[PDB]
Design a protein around this ligand. Structure first.
Ligand code: UGB
Length: 582
């Protein structure tokens, strides 16, 4: 592709007024041949950018100028208002006729759903040096987010479920390694790697270089997922392949919110009941939260309305131009009617509106503290869905079903002091255990237990509780619907799990009657279709498990403490354990 002639032309083009990238060729020979490998390689990098980005590096620069101008002003809409199509989901912890009806319809729809996991983001802000999807959902079983999503999708959509994972340079190799180590076998998985974009050293959009003198690169945002899907093939486009196989929905999830497996079925059912082409997953928002709001927008006067996510800072500002909050918070679990999604994809080529958000070094000088780059957000695909021919709404769920692992222990302490959500590894794990319990009680399991915390973390800033710990695998519990849970416990009044107990269940298991004071693993057939291992009149007493806090005083020569332990601030002591197999 890279003719020496085209590379000179592009070099010429980039030095023209309005592009002005002369500072890249300081001290260079007049023509390409006279250039060395190191320089000829920089030109090549610039050139090849064309097949990563529409219009290549020249268009990228121009887009930068336009965005740098745009973002010096006040993003102001002419009109802002409650989205018309908002729907309240019933509680996840009450087995009402509605909830049953919605879980049943949504669970059937799961058979015809494409799943998309965005997992290109860095996990350091947490102070976790591995990929986020390798974090455990809980440390009782240590099941990773990656396994958790994939096993659930294969359970509800069958082994051949279509699944996409977006990775980036940061997470990609480690993602393939984790798939391999978990012995996950997902025949229709596509791993699509997002490419990095160039960075701007300054307000005039001059490209930045790193230490080795190479074009500096940063991520373009989770927005990339649409174009990556648009371009992927199986000579046939991926999406054509989905449509032709009968798939009817597509859902996008983020990398560490276990709540998605509970909200999705309900969202699907409501997308169907209310004919939604795009359905944002929401929770009631607290005025301070670092979370976007679902709004009905009108950019400039007389413009059509658009239902889109918008950030708070923008919301305060725009309100100035002209119960938690009238407006819902979008958690970025996005549920689409597939045909509608494909239409918008084909027409846009998966390209969505962009922005830039430079972090300056001053409130004063237009000087960047660090190079900026153009970004995009995957939810902004909503902008391409006009109110004329598409129905875009949101479903509001209980805040509790939103359980991301976003913050370090130190961030969470500060957040909690300001009255906000910690959303850290400790409260992620705790919320997961609590979620199982609330669900199981909803079908009549009699769980009595203290609301008091059992360990404190973050230098005594706040506490969590973990027990009783009850974890059912996807063979055991299937989709996790209330009905599916009731098949595991068909006579729940005879199952007595004490507040300090641990119950781990794997495989085809039915528990009719049990008294548990301690820790127990019950294993049944790994085959979903095999004859179940049935437990009746079991009585199990042992020392069980405990949890304790990681003490300030940490050794680093002979400790088996990992980052996984440290980011939550406690460890489970797995002191004893009864096993029932067969
Ligand atoms: O959770 C929320 O409640 C918010 O999520 C969003 O905020 P964010 O600030 O983006 O935070 P963050 O956790 O970093 O990235 C999210 C995902 O994309 C992935 N991701 C990210 C960047 C990227 O370049 N590639 C990628 O795959 C990454 O791997 C992860 O899975 C919505 O925009 C916001 O409206 C709100 O819904």
């Amino acid at each position: 592709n890279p003719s020496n002639s085209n590379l000179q032309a592009l070099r010429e083009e980039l030095c023209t007024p309005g592009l002005d990238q002369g500072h890249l060729f300081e001290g260079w020979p007049e023509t390409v041949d006279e250039c060395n490998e190191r320089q000829i390689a920089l030109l090549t990098d610039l050139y090849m950018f064309s097949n990563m980005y529409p219009g290549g590096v020249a268009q990228y620069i121009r887009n930068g100028h336009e965005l740098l101008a745009r973002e010096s002003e006040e993003v102001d809409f002419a009109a802002l208002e409650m989205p018309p199509l908002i729907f309240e989901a019933p509680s996840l912890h009450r087995r009402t006729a509605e909830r049953t009806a919605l879980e049943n319809a949504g669970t059937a729809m799961l058979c015809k759903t494409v799943f998309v996991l965005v997992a290109g983001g860095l996990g350091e802000r947490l102070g976790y040096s591995s990929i986020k999807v390798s974090l455990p959902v809980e440390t009782a079983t240590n099941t990773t987010y990656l396994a958790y999503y994939l096993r659930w999708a294969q359970r509800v959509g069958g082994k051949e479920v279509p699944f996409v994972i977006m990775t980036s340079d940061d997470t990609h190799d480690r993602t393939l390694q984790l798939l391999r180590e978990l012995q996950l076998e997902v025949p229709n998985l596509h791993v699509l790697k997002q490419g990095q974009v160039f960075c701007f050293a300054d307000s005039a959009a001059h490209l930045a270089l790193d230490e080795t003198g190479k074009l500096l690169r940063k991520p373009h945002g989770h927005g990339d997922v649409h174009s990556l899907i648009y371009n992927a093939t199986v000579a046939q486009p991926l999406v054509n392949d989905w449509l032709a196989a009968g798939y009817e929905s597509i859902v996008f999830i983020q990398d560490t919110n276990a709540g998605a497996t509970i909200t999705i079925p309900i969202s699907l059912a409501l997308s169907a009941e209310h004919s939604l082409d795009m359905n944002f997953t929401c929770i009631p928002r607290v005025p301070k939260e670092p979370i976007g709001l679902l709004c009905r927008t009108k950019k400039n006067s007389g413009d059509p309305w658009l239902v889109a996510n918008v950030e708070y800072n923008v919301f305060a500002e725009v309100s100035r131009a002209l119960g938690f909050s009238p407006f819902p918070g979008s958690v970025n679990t996005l549920v689409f009617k597939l045909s509608s999604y494909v239409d918008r994809l084909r027409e846009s080529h998966g390209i969505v509106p962009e922005f830039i958000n430079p972090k300056y070094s001053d409130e004063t000088r237009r000087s960047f503290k660090k190079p900026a780059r153009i970004e995009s957000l995957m939810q902004d695909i909503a902008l391409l869905f006009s109110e004329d021919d598409y129905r875009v709404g949101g479903t509001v769920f209980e805040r509790f079903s939103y359980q991301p692992v976003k913050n370090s222990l130190e961030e969470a302490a500060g957040l909690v002091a300001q009255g906000n959500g910690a959303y850290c590894a400790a409260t992620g794990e705790a919320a997961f255990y609590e979620l199982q319990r609330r669900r199981l009680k909803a079908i009549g399991l009699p769980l009595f237990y203290s609301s008091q915390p059992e360990v404190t973390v973050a230098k005594d800033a706040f506490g969590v509780r973990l027990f009783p710990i009850i974890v059912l695998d996807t063979v055991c519990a299937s989709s996790g619907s209330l009905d599916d849970l009731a098949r595991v416990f068909p006579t729940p009044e005879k199952v007595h799990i004490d507040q300090h107990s641990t119950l781990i269940v794997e495989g085809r298991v039915i528990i009719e009657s049990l008294e548990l004071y301690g820790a127990l693993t019950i294993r049944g057939p790994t085959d979903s279709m095999a004859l179940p291992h049935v437990v009746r009149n079991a009585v199990v007493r042992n020392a069980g498990w405990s949890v304790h806090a990681i003490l300030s005083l940490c050794a680093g020569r002979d400790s088996r403490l990992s980052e996984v332990d440290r980011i939550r601030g406690f460890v489970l002591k797995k002191t004893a354990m009864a096993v029932m197999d067969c």
